[PDB]
Amino acid sequence: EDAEAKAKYEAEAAFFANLKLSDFNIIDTLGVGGFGRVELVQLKSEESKTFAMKILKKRHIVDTRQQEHIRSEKQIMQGAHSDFIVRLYRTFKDSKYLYMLMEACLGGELWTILRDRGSFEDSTTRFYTACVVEAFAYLHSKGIIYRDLKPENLILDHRGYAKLVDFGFAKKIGFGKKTWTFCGTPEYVAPEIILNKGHDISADYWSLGILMYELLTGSPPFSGPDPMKTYNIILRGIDMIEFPKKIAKNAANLIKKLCRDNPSERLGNLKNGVKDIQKHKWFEGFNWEGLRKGTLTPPIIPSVASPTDTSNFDSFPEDNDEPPPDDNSGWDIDF
Ligand SMILES: CCCOc1ccc(OC)c(F)c1C(=O)c1ccc(C(=O)N[C@@H]2CNC[C@H]2NC(=O)c2ccc3[nH]ncc3c2)cc1
């Protein structure tokens, strides 16, 4: 890419290769999940430098058969250099835990901001969707499906730019091949996943349409009391849903083109690929070059006092549970 950008990536690589776990102190929690959590950590030698550290329990990964998913998360996320994807700088490992040292984005999870605001305006949603589109353009060009798009997986940096996190379901898929794991939130799964027909990158465009709908109204378009009713609603299709009047004509047209039943008919999957999404009328006048250059003013400007401020995140219970058993199976050799 840019020669200066490349030299910076190489220097960064050399800098993190020198680091050890004992160089860091823990500041606070940014998130929690099934078998781990994300902590804000601070470098002892430079108080200005804070990071996000995902800490996962190895035995639980083994018990849930998530080994290849986590390996893929490291590979995909560590090799990605996109301004719209949180960086994974490196990993650590011991007998009990895996440790993923990531770029810190202190503006908050989009899900909590959506919750507190109820819904996002058209122009606000367009900015966040464009951030996803750019992340998708980068991933899809390298044959990588992401599969976990939803508001909890978009983080804002201190400027208000949005970035993808949580690549545990992201996967490299070959030309003309399909993958078969049933993963993801019931509200976001494409019909080809529900029907166990195999899915490919086209499932990501489906999920983009779901995201637009949820950001604009506060809720995904297909939702039922239980997962089974939700799946049937999804099978009925996006044309059977009565779009609220708050969704602008152009947004609704783009949502329905993203959420085509046939994966081959979905926008982003046609002749011009992702360009067909970016050139859609809903993005008319949107300055993509300024988005990529960081010139554009985000819709919501977060307040971040310092590199240790976690005020834009919910409170999270401390994990004071007895440590998990040692895992020496060795699937984590590369970590
Ligand atoms: C029994 C089923 C288990 O569920 C899984 C199923 C599969 C799997 O992998 C295949 C799993 F790991 C799991 C997990 O156990 C799991 C453990 C923790 C988390 C988690 O904390 N998520 C955060 C909260 N919400 C978004 C995330 N935020 C960041 O990640 C982040 C990253 C960098 C950042 N920089 N700045 C801010 C910032 C934020 C998620 C899932």
Side-chain angles (χ1 to χ4, degrees), residues 250-264 266-270 272-274 276-278 280-288 290-292 294-313:
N250 283 349
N253 186 268
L254 175 52
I255 280 156
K256 295 165 172 175
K257 288 199 178 211
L258 292 169
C259 295
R260 295 293 81 187
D261 288 359
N262 191 13
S264 55
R266 284 177 201 153
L267 201 67
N269 220 23
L270 315 182
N272 306 116
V274 188
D276 287 317
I277 298 181
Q278 301 167 304
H280 188 278
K281 212 72 167 283
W282 188 56
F283 288 109
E284 184 174 56
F286 184 87
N287 181 7
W288 292 95
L291 181 67
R292 298 190 272 257
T295 72
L296 180 49
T297 299
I300 302 175
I301 309 304
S303 173
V304 178
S306 90
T308 56
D309 176 16
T310 66
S311 57
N312 297 309
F313 293 77

Side-chain angles (χ1 to χ4, degrees), residues 48 50-58 60-64 66-67 69-74 76-90:
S48 63
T50 57
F51 304 85
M53 190 89 84
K54 202 171 183 183
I55 304 177
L56 304 181
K57 299 185 174 158
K58 293 214 295 177
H60 297 46
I61 295 167
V62 179
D63 292 340
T64 64
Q66 291 307 293
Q67 298 104 319
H69 281 165
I70 292 308
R71 294 175 98 151
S72 182
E73 180 175 19
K74 174 198 166 69
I76 294 188
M77 212 175 176
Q78 189 150 341
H81 296 285
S82 165
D83 292 355
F84 307 93
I85 300 170
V86 167
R87 291 230 34 217
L88 173 58
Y89 296 118
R90 75 160 290 172

Side-chain angles (χ1 to χ4, degrees), residues 160-171 174-228 230-232 234-235 237-241 243-244 246-248 250-264 266-270 272-274 276-278 280-288 290-292 294-308:
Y161 277 69
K163 296 188 189 211
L164 286 181
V165 295
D166 265 353
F167 278 66
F169 295 139
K171 191 182 184 173
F175 171 72
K177 296 305 296 182
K178 294 192 171 187
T179 197
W180 295 86
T181 308
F182 192 124
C183 52
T185 80
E187 286 75 16
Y188 271 80
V189 289
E192 66 265 29
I193 305 174
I194 285 167
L195 296 167
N196 185 39
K197 294 168 47 152
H199 57 276
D200 53 24
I201 271 167
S202 48
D204 274 345
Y205 304 130
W206 173 280
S207 77
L208 186 63
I210 309 286
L211 174 71
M212 285 178 62
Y213 197 106
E214 178 165 9
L215 289 191
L216 287 168
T217 64
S219 296
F222 318 107
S223 166
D226 50 76
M228 221 78 215
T230 301
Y231 297 148
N232 284 308
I234 291 171
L235 298 184
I238 190 69
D239 298 319
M240 289 304 122
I241 291 293
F243 280 47
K246 154 160 49 185
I247 305 188
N250 283 349
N253 186 268
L254 175 52
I255 280 156
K256 295 165 172 175
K257 288 199 178 211
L258 292 169
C259 295
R260 295 293 81 187
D261 288 359
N262 191 13
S264 55
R266 284 177 201 153
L267 201 67
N269 220 23
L270 315 182
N272 306 116
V274 188
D276 287 317
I277 298 181
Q278 301 167 304
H280 188 278
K281 212 72 167 283
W282 188 56
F283 288 109
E284 184 174 56
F286 184 87
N287 181 7
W288 292 95
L291 181 67
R292 298 190 272 257
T295 72
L296 180 49
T297 299
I300 302 175
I301 309 304
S303 173
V304 178
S306 90
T308 56

Side-chain angles (χ1 to χ4, degrees), residues 124-141:
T124 291
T125 295
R126 172 164 41 247
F127 177 95
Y128 297 145
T129 309
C131 286
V132 176
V133 169
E134 287 300 308
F136 277 6
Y138 174 87
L139 291 171
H140 294 165
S141 73

